Amino acid sequence: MEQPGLCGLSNLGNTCFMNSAIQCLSNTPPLTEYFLNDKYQEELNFDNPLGMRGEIAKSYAELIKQMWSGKFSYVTPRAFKTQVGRFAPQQELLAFLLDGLHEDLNRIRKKPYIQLKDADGRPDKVVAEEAWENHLKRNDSIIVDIFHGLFKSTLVCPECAKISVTFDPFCYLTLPLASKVKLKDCIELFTTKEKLGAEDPWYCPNCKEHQQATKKLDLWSLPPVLVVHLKRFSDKLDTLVDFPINDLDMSEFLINPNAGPCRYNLIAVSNHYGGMGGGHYTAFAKNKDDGKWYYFDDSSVSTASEDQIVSKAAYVLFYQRQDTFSGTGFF
Ligand SMILES: O=C1c2c(O)ccc(O)c2C(=O)c2c(NCCNCCO)ccc(NCCNCCO)c21
Ligand SMILES: [Zn+2]
């Protein structure tokens, strides 16, 4: 075709999930814009021991420039997949993709060792800000800017009443599934206090001993692009998760009381059809130039209506924060 971004991807074999993942990333406007304006050359990290000397970021840039040139109805991501395979010899490809891009473009030249401190008695605000600052001392890139948020973990040990509060970064949110359910039900279930199994207990440093310490997670800060992975694999759970296309307001789940509005509009959806033993991934994506929705099935690109987006096939959701929309301003 002749419109940039309406470009499919040939199936190199099975390459599970990679094409739909690339389409989700391709239709993440700030990421694609960063690559198309050649802002990535300045930031290529050539001797990061955790990176590919820039080869992942370079191959992704070439692929994205091809997809948004308007010259192709579909291309092959063969060089990109080759580099990704060298970075990750082998599931959730997305974490490895985001990590490969991040390290290839990390502004930190040499990561310093940071001694972990527990929250002690300090306020959540102080400890969260400390953790975010420490993270940026080790990880600072366009991938952090777009995708990273901060979550809280509270572990309470019944043996010695010890409470361990830690704040940790994330680049996507894996949600448990609660029969039809709403997305907010999955978020709510994500933040509920749980009892760790005997198969997965906590090593209490005060006790030098593992056992059933309660664990509860909380969202501290949410990124410009919130990636929400619905945990359908542990047989495959096909529950219809009803999620909004527009105006997802996350503020009720944020425990940072000085946080911003965090309202989101959906931009992409990774679908899976079948089960693990037999399955295929596709994607819905909103095109950044005309605002319409499209369906990407490898090389095939076609028009879509919002009627088709919310289905039980929905597997990963890409949301963009309304205050980060390019060329748009809220009051
Ligand atoms: O491609 C779909 C599919 C679709 O494009 C649109 C709607 C759908 O419902 C499907 C779909 O269900 C599907 C598969 N479903 C499970 C049947 N086999 C499972 C038992 O082994 C199992 C496999 C499957 N993919 C076959 C096409 N892929 C060829 C390249 O790998 C699909
Ligand atoms: Zn203990």
Numbering used by the authors: 254 to 343, 353 to 440, 755 to 810, 817 to 913
From the paper:
Furthermore, we determined the structure of a USP15–mitoxantrone complex, a Food and Drug Administration–approved antineoplastic drug, which has multiple cellular targets, including USP11 (25), that shows a novel binding mode for a USP ligand. We determined that USP15 is weakly inhibited by mitoxantrone with an IC50 value of 33 ± 11 μm. Co-crystallization trials in the presence of excess mitoxantrone yielded crystals of intense blue color that diffracted to 2.1 Å resolution (data collection and refinement statistics are shown in Table 1). After molecular replacement, an additional planar shape of electron density was visible in the vicinity of the BL2 region near the catalytic histidine that corresponded to the anthracenedione structure of mitoxantrone. The catalytic triad in this different crystal form is also misaligned in both USP15 copies present in the asymmetric unit in a similar configuration to the USP15-free enzyme structure. This USP15–mitoxantrone complex structure revealed predominantly hydrophobic interactions between mitoxantrone and USP15 residues Tyr855, Gly856, Gly860, His862, which are located in the BL2 region. In addition, one of mitoxantrone's side arms contacts the CC loop Asn264, although the density is weaker compared with the mitoxantrone anthracenedione core. There are no interactions of mitoxantrone with other neighboring USP15 molecules in the crystal lattice. This binding site coincides with the S1′ region of USP15, suggesting a rationale for the inhibition observed. In this position, mitoxantrone is expected to compete with substrate interactions, as indicated by modeling a diubiquitin molecule into the binding site based on a superposition with a USP30 C77A Lys6-linked diubiquitin structure, the closest available USP structure in complex with a substrate. Superposition of the USP15-free and mitoxantrone-bound structures revealed that the BL2 becomes ordered, but no other major conformational changes are observed upon mitoxantrone binding.
Ubiquitin-specific proteases (USPs)5 are key players in the regulation of important cellular signaling pathways through catalyzing the deconjugation reaction of ubiquitin from substrate proteins. The multifunctional protease USP15 regulates several important pathways in health and disease, including TGF-β, IGF-I, innate immune signaling, mRNA processing, and mitophagy. USP15, USP4, and USP11 share the same overall domain structure, including an N-terminal domain present in USPs (DUSP) and ubiquitin-like (UBL) domain followed by a protease domain that harbors a ∼300-amino acid insertion predicted to contain a second UBL domain. The USP15 catalytic core displays the characteristic USP protease domain fold, including a finger, palm, and thumb region.
